[PDB]
Amino acid sequence: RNLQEFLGGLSPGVLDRLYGHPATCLAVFRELPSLAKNWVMRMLFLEQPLPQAAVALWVKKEFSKAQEESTGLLSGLRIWHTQLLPGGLQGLILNPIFRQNLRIALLGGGKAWSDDTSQLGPDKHARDVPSLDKYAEERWEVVLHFMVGSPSAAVSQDLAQLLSQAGLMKSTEPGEPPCITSAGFQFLLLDTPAQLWYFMLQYLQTAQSRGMDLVEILSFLFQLSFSTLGKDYSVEGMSDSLLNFLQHLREFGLVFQRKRKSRRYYPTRLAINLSSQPGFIVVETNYRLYAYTESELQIALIALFSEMLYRFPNMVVAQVTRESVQQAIASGITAQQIIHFLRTRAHPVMLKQTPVLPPTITDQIRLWELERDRLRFTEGVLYNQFLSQVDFELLLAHARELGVLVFENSAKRLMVVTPAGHSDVKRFWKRQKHSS
Template sequence: MAMLYMPSSFPAADLEAWFKPSARSAREQALSILDRLHILASKREDDRSLSYSLIPGFQRSLRQAIEGSGTHRTFGVPASKAESGGKRLGIEFLDQHARQQWEGILFFMVSGAAGFQPGSVRMDVGPGTKKLLHAGDLVRTVHGTPKITKEGFSFVLQETNAQVWNLLIVYLKMVNDLGMSETEVLSFLFMLGSLELGQDYSTSTLSPTQLQMLDDLSAMGIVYRSSKESRTFYPTRLATTLTSDSGALPGSDIATSEKPDHKAQKKGFIIIETNYRLYAYTNSLIQIAILSLFTKLQHRFPNLVSGKLTKESVHRAVQAGITSAQIISYLTTYAHPQMQKSNPPLPPTVMDQIRLWEYEGERVEVTTGYLMREFGSEAEYRDVLGYAEALGVLVWKNDASRCFFISHVEQVAGYLKKKKESKGR
């Protein structure tokens, strides 16, 4: 940064004065990295002394980024009064939009496995977001119902900032398939992290790729755009905290008719007895859905649900890909303050029994079926695999080896026969 506005090169002798003699290797390594990244250049002066200077292109771009000058609009372009219509949305509305969209995604992930009926809670999860969750292997569709995976359960337990970045990383991996530029996608994401919450920004300077991103990110609650034709957009708290360690959605909860007790949920709300009975002081549908993944829930009150950890409920969770370590970690993280006074917070007998139930559930099970392999092409493999998955007969697959295992072969064999006959005509 000291070199950014220097009119001349920076002498190497002055640079060496900044470092201790013991840090010489670290200095040389840093200089080598900056040189390979085309950030720093070295040259010999007339007196044969060595000096350093920033690459002109990098120096110019960094100046513009810091000053907000130039035409690249690193920090976005605030909307004019004509574009915004003279009205600006409040931060409370933006937080509500972000919370509703993001928690709708989380509830979509856990609701299927938890047994919630479609439509029991208002969820606005678009097809693009669902495709993203499937691409990240966070959920899988089984008989038309989304089921959370082991990776999905780990995802749900993370902080909101980590969840957002994990989903955005999946999004980045898909940009080539979507016909988008990786550079523009990354540039736009970092720009969002520097925007001001509550300020509306113009879409006039955005590229086609970034305009497409607005629709995708709006569905996730990262930005708000009233319609595809709107000339402005608002970053939500999910966007403005992308490059910070601030909480993205403090006190988040699925919208319910009851007022959620965020303070209680933040400090822990689960009590477990040595007889495996569980009491959770919460009215959050997300938390209730997560608990139901590995607990047999029995009663629900306005601010309390009760149930029991059973062999069957833990086996069901294990079959869904959830491990005993994840269950214990979740229960420990959200243990009631009274339980947190003990070390460990959970009764040792409960933790041991959860592990034993997992071991029992991991015993080998024999499934009668048929192994499909030796496909002529990747397209043929994907086609037949998709047909088997749609029928609900797919048991296991290995994309790398182009083979999969199905429980029934009759309809799949008929499908292959028809395809062969159609090619022969």
């Protein structure tokens, strides 16, 4: 799921409380479509509602579908609310709180998002941007290795429980380590910003168990999203629970902090990328992958759907075979996920070509994917004992009404239904003959 889907199901009060922070409003505005942004900007400096027809006349008739979609999305997000214009007309005006916060974020005004940074002076143990990036990469690699099950990576108990609640890994028995499921493989194949966003969404969903304020967590996350890289921020000014949540972020690599009691925290590159690098995989027409990577995580991920051939100290040469792709699919990974992963990790050299990946390789992978699903199997019960067409039609209509029909053929008067509905169909058939 995406941000818009998550925000659609929230109550109006929660949405209004979210708009109280300028950082949240900017993120919501950037998540809007291109057409919606122009409407928001035009209505930013308006103190009076506008007629619905006047707004509808801005976009041409041919692109009315995009206008309708944008209007529906804005109404669902409650960015604007319809106003009862005098004379029976309907006026459209943006939410005053959202508009005020957006103007504060853009034009200026009010207090800063962070309390202060120069009160405590320069950090005694400050790090650099490459160090923060290395720390974030190490944390993410440790998390993903713990997802795989490598003993070298050990995380906190609550983090492991969160993965179990997310369904990526299941713990069949207490004490024994959980096993990664197909959903875990799909999560691994996802892009890093997508993985971070999915993990944050799962955290937000499970936050209701801990009784934490969703609005505060969302506002803090959005503030971290726009935070400048390499600049510390004041820990003070936050509730006790949020700091605890921040500690979990410290385990996730999004936020770096020297000590729990330290008053300085440095947002990392991964935290910035959460709101939204060059790729290290070269794909050749002969079904060969050349990866410029050294960490065991990427090697394992590539070996999930490919056969390894050579491992030079700074290079990995692998071959994409039919058997490897079939094994990966049997593991639960679809071809679309593999193609997306290859495109995301594609080397910058391959970006020169008009297609990111050669069409032949993608077509071959997709065809290999369809090989497993070529045969369709449906367990059920077949009825072929119809003496008359009229009797067959009534039973077929009853089965369709029950919604247990699998296959119908009026030409030969043969039908196939689910075993669960077989008892109901038999009871219906007996009643028709007995009552006759």
